[PDB]
Amino acid sequence: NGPEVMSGESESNLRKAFEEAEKNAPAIIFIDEIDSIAPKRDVERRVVSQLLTLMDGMKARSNVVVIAATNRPNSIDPALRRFGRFDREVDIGDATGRLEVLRIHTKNMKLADDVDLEALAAETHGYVG
Amino acid sequence: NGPEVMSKMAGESESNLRKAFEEAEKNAPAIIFIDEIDSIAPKRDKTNGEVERRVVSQLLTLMDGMKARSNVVVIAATNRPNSIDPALRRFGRFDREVDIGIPDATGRLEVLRIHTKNMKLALAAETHGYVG
Amino acid sequence: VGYDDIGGCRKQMAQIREMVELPLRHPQLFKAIGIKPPRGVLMYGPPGTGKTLMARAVANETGAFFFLINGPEVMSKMAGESESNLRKAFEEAEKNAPAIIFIDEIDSIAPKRDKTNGEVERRVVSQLLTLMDGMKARSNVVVIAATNRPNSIDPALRRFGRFDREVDIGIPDATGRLEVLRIHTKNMKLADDVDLEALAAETHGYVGADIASLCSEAAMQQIREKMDLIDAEVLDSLGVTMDNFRFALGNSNPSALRETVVESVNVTWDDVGGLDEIKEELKETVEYPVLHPDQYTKFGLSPSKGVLFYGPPGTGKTLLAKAVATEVSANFISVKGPELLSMWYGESESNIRDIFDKARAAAPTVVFLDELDSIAKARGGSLGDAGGASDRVVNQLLTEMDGMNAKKNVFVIGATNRPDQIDPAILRPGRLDQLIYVPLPDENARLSILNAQLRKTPLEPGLELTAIAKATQGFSGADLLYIVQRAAKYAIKDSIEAHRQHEAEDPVPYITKEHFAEAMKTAKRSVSDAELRRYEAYSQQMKASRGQF
Amino acid sequence: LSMWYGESESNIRDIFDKARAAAPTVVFLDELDSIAKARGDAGGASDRVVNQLLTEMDGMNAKKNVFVIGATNRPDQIDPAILRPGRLDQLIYVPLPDENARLSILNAQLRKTPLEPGLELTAIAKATQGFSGADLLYIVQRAAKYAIKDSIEAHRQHEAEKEVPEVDPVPYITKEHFAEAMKTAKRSVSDAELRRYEAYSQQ
Amino acid sequence: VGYDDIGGCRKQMAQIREMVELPLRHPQLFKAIGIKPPRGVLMYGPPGTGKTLMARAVANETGAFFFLINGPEVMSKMAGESESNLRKAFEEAEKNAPAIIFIDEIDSIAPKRDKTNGEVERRVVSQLLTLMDGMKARSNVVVIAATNRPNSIDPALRRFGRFDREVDIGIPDATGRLEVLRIHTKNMKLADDVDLEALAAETHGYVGADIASLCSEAAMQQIREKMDLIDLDEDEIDAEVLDSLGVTMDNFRFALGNSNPSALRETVVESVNVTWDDVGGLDEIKEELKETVEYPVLHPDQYTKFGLSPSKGVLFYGPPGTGKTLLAKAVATEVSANFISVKGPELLSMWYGESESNIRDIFDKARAAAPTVVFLDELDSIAKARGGSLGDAGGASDRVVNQLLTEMDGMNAKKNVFVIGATNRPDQIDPAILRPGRLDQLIYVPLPDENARLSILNAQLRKTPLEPGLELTAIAKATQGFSGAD
Amino acid sequence: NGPEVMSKMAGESESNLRKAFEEAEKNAPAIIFIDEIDSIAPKRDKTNGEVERRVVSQLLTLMDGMKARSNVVVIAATNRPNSIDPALRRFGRFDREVDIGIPDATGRLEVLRIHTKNMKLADDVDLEALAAETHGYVG
Amino acid sequence: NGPEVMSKMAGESESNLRKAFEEAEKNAPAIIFIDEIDSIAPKRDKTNGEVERRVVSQLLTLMDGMKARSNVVVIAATNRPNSIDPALRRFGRFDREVDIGDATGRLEVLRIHTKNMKLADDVDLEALAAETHGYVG
Amino acid sequence: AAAAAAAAAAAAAVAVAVAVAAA
Ligand SMILES: [Mg+2]
Ligand SMILES: [Mg+2]
Ligand SMILES: [Mg+2]
Ligand SMILES: [Mg+2]
Q: For every residue of F49-114, which 3-state class applies, written as one string?
A: CHHHHHHHHHHHHHHCCCCCCCCEEEEEECCCHHHCCHHHCCCCCCCCCCCCCCCCHHHHHHHHHH
Chain H residues within 8 A of B3 when measuring between CB atoms = none
State the burial class of residue B16 (Cβ atoms within 10 Å of its Cβ: 0-12, 13-18, 19+): middle
Whole-number Å distance between alpha carbons of F99 and D156: 75
- State CA C534 to chain mean position distance: 37
G27: annotated binding-site residue? Answer: no
Instruction: List the subunits that have 3+ CB pairs under 8 angstroms with H.
Output: B, C, D, E, F, G
- Choose, out of C31, C36, C83, C126, the residue to mutate when testing the contact with B (most B CBs < 10 Å): C126
H or E segment and range at residue C548: none
- Choose, out of D135, D184, D188, the residue to mutate when testing the contact with C (most C CBs < 10 Å): D188
- Per DSSP (E only), the strands in C65-212 are 65-69, 99-103, 142-146, 165-168
Instruction: List the subunits that have 3+ CB pairs under 8 angstroms with C.
Output: B, D, E, H
Instruction: Determine how many CB atoms are found less than 10 A away from the CB of residue E155.
Output: 20
Of F11, F66, F91, nearest to E68 by CB-CB distance is F66
Q: How far is CA B47 from CA B15, C498, E276, F7, in A?
A: 22, 83, 72, 19
Chain A residues within 8 A of B53 when measuring between CB atoms = 7
Chain D residues within 8 A of H17 when measuring between CB atoms = 41-42
Whole-number Å distance between alpha carbons of C99 and G70: 71
Q: Does E47 touch chain F (CB under 8 A)?
A: yes
Whole-number Å distance between alpha carbons of G58 and F35: 10
Q: Do D41 and H12 touch (CB under 8 A)?
A: no
Whole-number Å distance, alpha carbon C379 to ligand 1 midpoint, is 46
Task: Please name which of E55, E64, E70, E81 lies closest in space to residue E21, comparing C-alpha atoms.
Answer: E64
Tell me the nearest-neighbour CA distance from C339 into chain D, angstroms.
Answer: 18
Q: Does H15 touch chain G (CB under 8 A)?
A: yes
Whole-number Å distance between alpha carbons of G67 and B1: 57
Range 89-108 of E in CB contact (< 8 A) with C: none
Helices then strands (H, E): number in chain C? 21, 10
The secondary structure of C295-360 as a DSSP string is HHHHHT-PPP--EEEE-SSSSSHHHHHHHHHHS-SSEEEEE-SSTT--SBSSHHHHHHHHHHHHHH
Whole-number Å distance between alpha carbons of C335 and E412: 11
* First-to-final CA distance of chain G: 21
- State CA A2 to chain mean position distance: 9
Q: Does G34 touch chain A (CB under 8 A)?
A: no
Whole-number Å distance, alpha carbon C50 to ligand 1 midpoint, is 6
- Choose, out of A40, A46, A56, the residue to mutate when testing the contact with G (most G CBs < 10 Å): A46
Yes or no: say if E211 and E181 are a contact pair by the CB < 8 Å rule.
yes
Our answer on whether C and E touch (3+ beta-carbon pairs < 8 Å) is yes
- State CA E305 to chain mean position distance: 27
Q: Does D193 touch chain C (CB under 8 A)?
A: yes
Chain D residues within 8 A of H13 when measuring between CB atoms = 3-5
Whole-number Å distance, alpha carbon E437 to ligand 2 midpoint, is 9
Find all residues with CB under 8 Å of D161, minimum gap 6, and list them: none
Task: Please name which of E279, E346, E358, E266 lies closest in space to residue E316, comparing C-alpha atoms.
Answer: E279
Find all residues with CB under 8 Å of E120, minimum gap 6, and list them: E75, E79, E82, F10, H6, H8
Whole-number Å distance between alpha carbons of E173 and E297: 12
Three-state DSSP class for C144?
A: strand
Interface residues of B toward H, Cβ cutoff 8 Å, are: 8-11, 48-49, 51
Q: In this structure, which long-range contacts are made by residues E471-478, counting pairs with CB atoms below 8 Å and at least 24 apart in sequence?
A: E476/E450, E476/E451, E477/E450
Q: How was this structure determined?
A: cryo-EM
E175: annotated binding-site residue? Answer: no
The count of residues in chain G is 137
Whole-number Å distance between alpha carbons of F138 and F109: 11
Yes or no: say if C400 and C366 are a contact pair by the CB < 8 Å rule.
no
Q: Do E35 and C215 touch (CB under 8 A)?
A: yes
A105: annotated binding-site residue? Answer: yes
Yes or no: say if C188 and C215 are a contact pair by the CB < 8 Å rule.
yes
| Helical packing angle, C389-401 and C347-361, nearest 10° | 20
Whole-number Å distance between alpha carbons of B103 and B101: 6
H or E segment and range at residue A125: none
State the burial class of residue C534 (Cβ atoms within 10 Å of its Cβ: 0-12, 13-18, 19+): middle
Amino acid present at C484: V
Our answer on whether H and D touch (3+ beta-carbon pairs < 8 Å) is yes
The single-letter DSSP state of residue C189 is: -
Q: Does G15 touch chain A (CB under 8 A)?
A: no
Whole-number Å distance between alpha carbons of D61 and D59: 7
Amino acid present at C260: T
Q: Do C216 and E34 touch (CB under 8 A)?
A: no
Instruction: Kindly identify the ligand whose nearest atom is closest to the C-alpha of E405.
Output: 2
Bond into E426 cis (ω within 30): no
Q: Does C297 touch chain D (CB under 8 A)?
A: no
Q: Does C389 touch chain D (CB under 8 A)?
A: yes
Whole-number Å distance between alpha carbons of C356 and C368: 12
Range 149-188 of E in CB contact (< 8 A) with C: 151, 155-156, 158-161, 164-166
The single-letter DSSP state of residue C5 is: T
The secondary structure of C440-501 as a DSSP string is ---HHHHHHHHHHHTTSS-B-SS--SHHHHHH-SS--HHHHHHHHHHHHHHHHHHHHHHHHH
Instruction: Determine how many CB atoms are found less than 10 A away from the CB of residue H23.
Output: 6
3-class SS letters over chain E? CCHHHCCCCHHHHHHHHHHHHHHHHCCHHHHHHCCCCCCEEEEECCCCCCHHHHHHHHHHHCCCEEEEEECHHHCCCCCCCHHHHHHHHHHHHHHHCCEEEEEECHHHCCCCCCCCCCHHHHHHHHHHHHHHCCCCCCCCCEEEEEECCCCCCCHHHCCCCCCCEEEECCCCCHHHHHHHHHHHCCCCCCCCCCCCHHHHHHCCCCCCHHHHHHHHHHHHHHHHHHHHHCCCCCCCCCHHHHCCCCCCHHHHHHHHHHCCCHHHCCCCCCCCCCCCCCCCCCHHHHHHHHHHHHHHHHCHHHHHHCCCCCCCCEEEECCCCCCHHHHHHHHHHHCCCEEEEECCCCCCCCECCHHHHHHHHHHHHHHHCCCEEEEEECHHHHCECCCCCCCCCCCHHHHHHHHHHHHHCCCCCCCCEEEEEEECCHHHECHHHHCCCCCCEEEECCCCCHHHHHHHHHHHCCCCCCCCCCCCHHHHHHHCCCCCCC
CA dihedral (E403, E408, E409, E410) positive or negative = positive
Task: Tell me phi and psi for residue E148, to 5 degrees.
Answer: -95, -20
Q: Does E465 touch chain F (CB under 8 A)?
A: no
Find all residues with CB under 8 Å of C485, minimum gap 6, and list them: E308, E309, E310, E311, E436, E440
Q: Does H5 touch chain E (CB under 8 A)?
A: yes
By C-alpha distance, the chain B residue nearest A6 is: B44
Q: Do C346 and D185 touch (CB under 8 A)?
A: no
Residues with CB under 5 A from ligand 2 (ion): C 318
Our answer on whether A and C touch (3+ beta-carbon pairs < 8 Å) is no
By C-alpha distance, the chain F residue nearest E215 is: F91
3-class SS letters over C127-139? HHHHHHCCCCCCC
Tell me the nearest-neighbour CA distance from D65 into chain B, angstroms.
Answer: 11
Instruction: List the subunits that have 3+ CB pairs under 8 angstroms with G.
Output: A, F, H
Three-state DSSP class for A68?
A: strand
3-class SS letters over chain G? CHHHHCCCCCCCHHHHHHHHHHHHHHHCCCEEEEECHHHHCCCCCCCCCHHHHHHHHHHHHHHCCCCCCCCCEEEEECCCCCCCCCCCCCCCCCCCCCCCCCHHHHHHHHHHHCCCCCCCCCCCHHHHHHHCCCCCC
Q: Does D40 touch chain H (CB under 8 A)?
A: no
Burial per residue of C32-57, b for 16 or more beta-carbon CB atoms within 10 angstroms, e otherwise: eeeeeeebbbbbbbbbbbbbbbbbbb
What is the dihedral angle through the alpha carbons of B24, B30, B36, B37, rounded to the nearest 10 degrees? 80
Whole-number Å distance between alpha carbons of C129 and C134: 9
Chain H residues within 8 A of E77 when measuring between CB atoms = 5-6
The single-letter DSSP state of residue H17 is: B
Whole-number Å distance between alpha carbons of C539 and C436: 10
Whole-number Å distance, alpha carbon D10 to ligand 4 midpoint, is 54
Whole-number Å distance between alpha carbons of B131 and C12: 27
Question: What Å resolution does this PDB entry report?
Answer: 3.3
Task: Please name which of E301, E393, E300 lies closest in space to residue E355, comparing C-alpha atoms.
Answer: E393
Task: Please name which of C217, C223, C203 lies closest in space to residue C245, comparing C-alpha atoms.
Answer: C217
* First-to-final CA distance of chain E: 63
Q: Do H7 and B48 touch (CB under 8 A)?
A: yes
E184: annotated binding-site residue? Answer: yes
Residue E6 φ/ψ region, left for φ over 0, alpha for ψ in the -120 to 50 degree band, beta for the rest: beta
By C-alpha distance, the chain C residue nearest H12 is: C344
Whole-number Å distance between alpha carbons of A31 and C390: 49
Chain F residues within 8 A of G11 when measuring between CB atoms = 3, 6-8, 12-13
Yes or no: say if E260 and E365 are a contact pair by the CB < 8 Å rule.
no
Q: Does D3 touch chain H (CB under 8 A)?
A: yes
Yes or no: say if B47 and H7 are a contact pair by the CB < 8 Å rule.
no
Whole-number Å distance, alpha carbon H19 to ligand 4 midpoint, is 29
Yes or no: say if E208 and E50 are a contact pair by the CB < 8 Å rule.
yes
Of F8, F47, F48, nearest to G11 by CB-CB distance is F8
Q: Does F116 touch chain G (CB under 8 A)?
A: no
